Amino acid sequence: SSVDGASGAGQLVPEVNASDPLAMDPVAGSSTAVATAGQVNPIDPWIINNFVQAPQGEFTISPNNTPGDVLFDLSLGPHLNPFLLHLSQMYNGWVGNMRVRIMLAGNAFTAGKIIVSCIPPGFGSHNLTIAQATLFPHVIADVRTLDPIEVPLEDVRNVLFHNNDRNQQTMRLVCMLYTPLRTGGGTGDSFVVAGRVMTCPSPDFNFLFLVPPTVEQKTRPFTLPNLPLSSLSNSRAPLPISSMGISPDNVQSVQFQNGRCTLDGRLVGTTPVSLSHVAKIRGTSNGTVINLTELDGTPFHPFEGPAPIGFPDLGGCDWHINMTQFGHSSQTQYDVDTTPDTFVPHLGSIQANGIGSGNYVGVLSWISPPSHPSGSQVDLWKIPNYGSSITEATHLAPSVYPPGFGEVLVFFMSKMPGPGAYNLPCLLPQEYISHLASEQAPTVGEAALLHYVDPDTGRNLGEFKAYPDGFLTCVPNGASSGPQQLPINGVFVFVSWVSRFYQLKPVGTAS
Amino acid sequence: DPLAMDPVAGSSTAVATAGQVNPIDPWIINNFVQAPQGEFTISPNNTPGDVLFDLSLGPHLNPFLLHLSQMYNGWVGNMRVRIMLAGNAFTAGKIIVSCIPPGFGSHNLTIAQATLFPHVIADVRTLDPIEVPLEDVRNVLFHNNDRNQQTMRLVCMLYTPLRTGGGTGDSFVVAGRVMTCPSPDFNFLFLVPPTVEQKTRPFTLPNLPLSSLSNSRAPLPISSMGISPDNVQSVQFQNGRCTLDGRLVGTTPVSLSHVAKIRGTSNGTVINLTELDGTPFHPFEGPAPIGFPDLGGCDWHINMTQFGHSSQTQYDVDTTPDTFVPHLGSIQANGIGSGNYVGVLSWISPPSHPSGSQVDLWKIPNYGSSITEATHLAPSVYPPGFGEVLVFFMSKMPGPGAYNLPCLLPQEYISHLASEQAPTVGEAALLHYVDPDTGRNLGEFKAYPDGFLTCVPNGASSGPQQLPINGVFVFVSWVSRFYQLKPVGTAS
Amino acid sequence: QNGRCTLDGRLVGTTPVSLSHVAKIRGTSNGTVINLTELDGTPFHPFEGPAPIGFPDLGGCDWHINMTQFGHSSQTQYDVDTTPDTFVPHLGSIQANGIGSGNYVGVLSWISPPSHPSGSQVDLWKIPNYGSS
Amino acid sequence: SSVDGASGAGQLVPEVNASDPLAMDPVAGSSTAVATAGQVNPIDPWIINNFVQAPQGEFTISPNNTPGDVLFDLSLGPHLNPFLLHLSQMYNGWVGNMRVRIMLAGNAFTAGKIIVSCIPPGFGSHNLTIAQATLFPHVIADVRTLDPIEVPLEDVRNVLFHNNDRNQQTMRLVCMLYTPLRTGGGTGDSFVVAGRVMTCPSPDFNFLFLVPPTVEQKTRPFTLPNLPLSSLSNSRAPLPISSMGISPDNVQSVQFQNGRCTLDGRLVGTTPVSLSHVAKIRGTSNGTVINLTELDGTPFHPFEGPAPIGFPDLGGCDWHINMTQFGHSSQTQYDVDTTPDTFVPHLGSIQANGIGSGNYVGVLSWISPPSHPSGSQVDLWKIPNYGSSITEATHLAPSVYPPGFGEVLVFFMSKMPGPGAYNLPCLLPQEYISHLASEQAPTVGEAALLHYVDPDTGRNLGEFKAYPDGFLTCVPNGASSGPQQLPINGVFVFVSWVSRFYQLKPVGTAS
């Protein structure tokens, strides 16, 4: 299976890693649980020795990385091996050790070292300095080493075995950059070292109790709906996606309230589940002020959020919705300016520039440049002013920004009907949101590496990173280049969980 | 580390129930031969996950075996595969080969997923050839020549990006070569009269230069290769339509002798069509008489003749009138005496009825919209593939201007395909447009089963138009879904 | 002269490969004499053969083609007698019994009994006279 | 003798070539002929083991080469070894095997592989694809391999032995590029791999019958006259050489009719043997039209060629020759325009713009810019219009063009007397032609590698390629540079036979 280039690698790089043994005693496997577990479930012997790419199987070192940066943080569990992960969904509990193999093999021109340290359960989370890492049983390796480093992840236990809950704390394997990475030679800065992590269970490892296959959440794999982008819709308005886009050089952080969902499936802001609630409002007109309620007719509440669920979040826009009513044959237009002191969505009170009394259901369908400021340009990156009710907790959705090395926020855009060429940007397609909500799959790792692919040929079109808070990022090639240059036939495919600093390959074509 | 597979038996299983067990020439037995799809290159531009090659266990991988398969009706055995890479000690990057069992599917994978199969990951710097056993995982005792037989597959993908050091010449790429050879387990099964079985017949294209051939829509010499304008995407001709199996579609005939011709009885008002043999046409058998011209946006007109009567009469036709019901064998006789003639399209003009506007030969004329009958038209063809474009064979036709007539397949090709009804194995046929004299490859094309070619144009102006018409199309091998063509044309 | 081919696969006489070159001629009409060329617009040569490749070989026949031209919407019947001394196919020079000047492409489509012998019967077994050079 | 840099080559390149044996049985040597040959002639034991550079001893790989390109094509015979070749001229027949050694050793930075395949006699000539080559017993090697690859060229025979005729078909060794050549590092594109081929006979090899030493043509070595360029003359006119030159960027193909000879010694066009026939005409003046004949007085014939042997071939020129006559004290001038319909050299008929009746002998000696076109410039690269007699086979000499990688045609030029600075270009010097004709030496290989050298110091001044059809080519350094910058004291020396694609080193100095 493994064929290191030893034969033709000359002798520019070290084959095997010479290192002192782990300052740690061996730990027992199943022998412990045998007497108290209800069952001791054996696993397929074929899995027992195959070193397979872990779900957290990739990482990257680059000269941008600084010593101390965490390349990957592995916590002992079935979730470290794809096969085990699948079997996890069927059992309740486990005990055993894992065999980890990190792979490196940079050019004979690269220099640098990493450090892997085992952290005992019960230590807790603390930001470790490279020097601190030394205090734990560790191993150090040169990035050029041909043969993969093998490190045993011992199952240090206080109890007989483990269950599939959050009350469990297992041992960790933290890998950080030890010394800065620096390529010599004709330095192609596009050069970063691509690492791989593979694992296989030690024969001590065993699953414990047979249980209904899917029920537990801890075992659920992160999945994305297999649907071409074009077929999906926007989250800030009921419009179909047209293309992907990037925020102008000026715009950096964003605070959209609709179309926000955590990768675990947690809805944030005013984000609803279905499009049937997107960019709409319901309330009773007083001929002067409209008293808002949820679309269900249920009463809105200032402690609930910034505004009623589904309440449109277009900022630098002077939007006007189409309002309809039940039992009354009519269709009117409601022009709204987000500037006036009468615009207090947070208190279920807004203006009524020309609407009779009653109760309506309006759908945003026509926007225009903001009137009140100075009769100026449209800025859809902005969010409207939700009544600053000092007497009520304005629970807003936080702002997002790209945390990676030269990464930028990626938006899904659809053209919006108005007095010009407008296109509404959102963070995630509505359907994606709907999916995540259903499958509340726990997010393992700081980010999810995705590969945008053409379903027909299976050609990798782009590389993106999805962050926990619910948003994608990418590295645009040239200033002119970016995801806008990509077709909307593709689908996003989850590749592996990665660290905050996994460096992506620039997207698009620069010329 | 080893391969996650138990070895599979060879002929052992066959002996008991096959009629014979035929041995192979020992010289072939362990001689490594390059496979048809045996070439690939890894440029720094490839990303981990890109597919380098795809293989299916079968006699077709080895030309010797292939030639032999046409003499026996079965086989079982294991091949040996060798991948060889060409790299310096100054490179880096790994490749991964996964063994995919038959009965899986052609869905695309992640490099992570590729690991889940018994696999081999090699570092680019390796000097020695990488040997991987292609095992005959079987559900049955042995294989009978079928397309139903699914075999062991080998998929190769880039595992880690190619990173070359030194004064990095981005022109630098790691080339790869694939070779196979049967192992002593392999054996052919029953001796059958050579080339009689259809299932074994190899795909073949006539060994003739494009220039000497003709169009399948009108009896005109092919003068150039062209592409449909950015505006024209889907096409749907009715003549010059033929599957690689050798099945004639639409009104497509075999010989040029039936191309762009019609025969029928003139009522002095309406012309009642029939097949060229004087046989009755039938709205159910097809959308129009076999050989009936399919030139769309054109105000074309033939030169009719008759037997036993010394005469030549120009018959003008507009494809717009409600009297134009080709599907019912009834058309207009705009100024024709009664009788029964034989017309041949010889002069075209821009369509009169739309507004006296321009000609569009990419279009197809209207074949009498009969609801009662089954106007079984030949389906529209569009280019299937990421950036693949439809290739056409054009000939200049006489009229008031420049009339380059598009075509899908030279008639001669059609005549050939029908004769040798070769089964289509795989998704597309990789072809090479070679210059006969130099034996040099001028372009890489794809032939799809339905009967048409495709290619990847280099620049917006660059493409097949920039190629000489002295080349011959040579069949290389049956390619996979993942095969990406090499851009054709001279870009600079 | 057409439809002549050895089993080795060697084309003999004016025999072409495709029907697309059968019973056809292309040349420049001098309004008196027609100066022939190969269908590609390439020059014919008395030494390479007895006549242009694809040039009809119907003998005892007073045949005549239907000529066309590119960039000109036209169809003109060109009548031919294989007896006249002006009929020198071998030298790419023939009669233009009533044809305007230009360069056309003719296809044999209608035959009649030979006029010059005595207005007698047709003999398709014969071969026409290719200018005795 | 052989000292591979193993000691200091580090371990960046492979020493020995690891390859599976040749799928082929050993073949017998002399043992066969012993009983029926009249004699079995032994050869000097010193030749038996010396690996010497074969006459087809050089080849070059460059990134311009594409897989499939033939680097060299060797056919079994004495002509593969310089010593044997010389002995060949003395014997009639042979039998035996050869030992071939191809040498490579590119930088540790180059990557690439070649393939050598043995092709059985009786297969014939076919353009093989790299994949086809695999079907024959073959060997593959990496261009970096230090130690020379040794391949036995087996004498597969249908008969007992061989004779020195063309009825013989021996085994071949075709070497093609297997994978594209690509240099890494600080890529100096001037970098191409210089290969060498050396051979020595296997002790099985033996010559057969003693025969008069030179008589047979098959054995004759290609030779060039050892004379400094300056001493030679032009082929299109009786003028001494002045300097070498290149066709202007615009001119590519040429069709000169005089000064054309195949390397085997075959005269083409109107090319005569001696200068005494160059640029001359003879015929009888009719006061209006001159009826041409050969200089011998013999009658010219339209089936013979384009014009009488020696008939001047200057195209874009309005030339006028000096005409003399026998028995009549006179010297007149004959001004000729190559445009008129009266100018039918192919039919032995030309004008007589002012010449009385009789028979003359004219020598081109004065040229002027073409009158009839538009009174425009002189283009000596052109060839005049030879009467397009449709009733006669205009057997013209084909056109020539450089087939190599960035190669251009090399011309020999002499200054011609006229109204300005004119210089007549030709393909080969007349004397060279005279030589080739005498020594009809068979041409082995697609081209002959020549080295222009200063006879006094023996310094290599330039590298050129002579093609079978009779013309040289070279790679000019800069646009300003070329062979015009070289002295005319040099002599051309045959180095080795090479493939069509042998890449030459640019000539001259660019600045």
PDB file of C-alpha atoms in Angstrom, chain A residues 454 456-459 489, chain B residues 226-230 232-235 381-392 427-431 444-450 452-459 462-464 479-488:
ATOM      1  CA  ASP A 454     -19.152  19.354 -11.146  1.00  0.00           C
ATOM      2  CA  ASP A 456     -21.148  15.175 -14.214  1.00  0.00           C
ATOM      3  CA  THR A 457     -17.355  14.899 -14.496  1.00  0.00           C
ATOM      4  CA  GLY A 458     -16.400  14.989 -10.832  1.00  0.00           C
ATOM      5  CA  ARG A 459     -13.855  17.690 -11.542  1.00  0.00           C
ATOM      6  CA  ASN A 489     -23.981  23.436 -11.629  1.00  0.00           C
TER       7      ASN A 489
ATOM      8  CA  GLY B 226     -16.289  23.397 -37.975  1.00  0.00           C
ATOM      9  CA  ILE B 227     -18.042  24.266 -34.733  1.00  0.00           C
ATOM     10  CA  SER B 228     -21.506  25.647 -34.023  1.00  0.00           C
ATOM     11  CA  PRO B 229     -21.552  29.370 -33.070  1.00  0.00           C
ATOM     12  CA  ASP B 230     -21.818  30.214 -29.333  1.00  0.00           C
ATOM     13  CA  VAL B 232     -26.226  27.282 -31.423  1.00  0.00           C
ATOM     14  CA  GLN B 233     -26.149  24.663 -28.665  1.00  0.00           C
ATOM     15  CA  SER B 234     -28.558  21.832 -29.442  1.00  0.00           C
ATOM     16  CA  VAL B 235     -28.643  20.348 -32.958  1.00  0.00           C
ATOM     17  CA  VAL B 381     -27.979  16.039 -29.561  1.00  0.00           C
ATOM     18  CA  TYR B 382     -26.205  18.393 -27.173  1.00  0.00           C
ATOM     19  CA  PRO B 383     -22.541  18.285 -26.025  1.00  0.00           C
ATOM     20  CA  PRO B 384     -22.327  16.188 -22.808  1.00  0.00           C
ATOM     21  CA  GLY B 385     -19.297  17.199 -20.802  1.00  0.00           C
ATOM     22  CA  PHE B 386     -17.473  19.922 -18.950  1.00  0.00           C
ATOM     23  CA  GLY B 387     -16.425  22.191 -21.806  1.00  0.00           C
ATOM     24  CA  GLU B 388     -16.774  19.660 -24.610  1.00  0.00           C
ATOM     25  CA  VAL B 389     -18.089  21.054 -27.908  1.00  0.00           C
ATOM     26  CA  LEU B 390     -19.792  19.393 -30.891  1.00  0.00           C
ATOM     27  CA  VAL B 391     -17.636  18.838 -33.989  1.00  0.00           C
ATOM     28  CA  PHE B 392     -19.037  19.122 -37.535  1.00  0.00           C
ATOM     29  CA  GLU B 427     -19.043   5.822 -22.600  1.00  0.00           C
ATOM     30  CA  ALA B 428     -16.993   7.321 -25.419  1.00  0.00           C
ATOM     31  CA  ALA B 429     -14.316   6.394 -27.923  1.00  0.00           C
ATOM     32  CA  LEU B 430     -11.075   8.313 -27.623  1.00  0.00           C
ATOM     33  CA  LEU B 431      -9.952   9.156 -31.133  1.00  0.00           C
ATOM     34  CA  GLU B 444      -7.621  14.470 -29.399  1.00  0.00           C
ATOM     35  CA  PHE B 445     -11.365  13.827 -29.875  1.00  0.00           C
ATOM     36  CA  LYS B 446     -14.268  11.949 -28.318  1.00  0.00           C
ATOM     37  CA  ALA B 447     -16.816   9.812 -30.170  1.00  0.00           C
ATOM     38  CA  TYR B 448     -20.145   9.359 -28.426  1.00  0.00           C
ATOM     39  CA  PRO B 449     -22.374   6.245 -28.981  1.00  0.00           C
ATOM     40  CA  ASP B 450     -25.275   8.222 -30.497  1.00  0.00           C
ATOM     41  CA  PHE B 452     -21.052  12.300 -33.137  1.00  0.00           C
ATOM     42  CA  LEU B 453     -17.706  13.741 -32.091  1.00  0.00           C
ATOM     43  CA  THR B 454     -16.666  16.353 -29.531  1.00  0.00           C
ATOM     44  CA  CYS B 455     -13.491  18.194 -28.546  1.00  0.00           C
ATOM     45  CA  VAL B 456     -12.147  20.940 -26.315  1.00  0.00           C
ATOM     46  CA  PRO B 457     -11.285  24.114 -28.281  1.00  0.00           C
ATOM     47  CA  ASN B 458      -8.094  25.853 -27.151  1.00  0.00           C
ATOM     48  CA  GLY B 459      -8.862  29.538 -27.693  1.00  0.00           C
ATOM     49  CA  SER B 462      -8.803  28.214 -31.974  1.00  0.00           C
ATOM     50  CA  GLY B 463     -10.301  24.817 -32.801  1.00  0.00           C
ATOM     51  CA  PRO B 464     -10.752  22.115 -35.532  1.00  0.00           C
ATOM     52  CA  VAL B 479     -12.732   6.098 -22.282  1.00  0.00           C
ATOM     53  CA  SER B 480     -14.424   6.764 -18.972  1.00  0.00           C
ATOM     54  CA  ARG B 481     -16.685   9.565 -17.733  1.00  0.00           C
ATOM     55  CA  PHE B 482     -13.688  11.190 -16.038  1.00  0.00           C
ATOM     56  CA  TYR B 483     -11.561  11.476 -19.184  1.00  0.00           C
ATOM     57  CA  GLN B 484     -10.732  15.097 -19.944  1.00  0.00           C
ATOM     58  CA  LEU B 485      -9.707  15.840 -23.531  1.00  0.00           C
ATOM     59  CA  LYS B 486      -6.616  17.747 -24.564  1.00  0.00           C
ATOM     60  CA  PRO B 487      -7.478  21.162 -26.043  1.00  0.00           C
ATOM     61  CA  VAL B 488      -7.289  21.084 -29.838  1.00  0.00           C
TER      62      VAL B 488
END
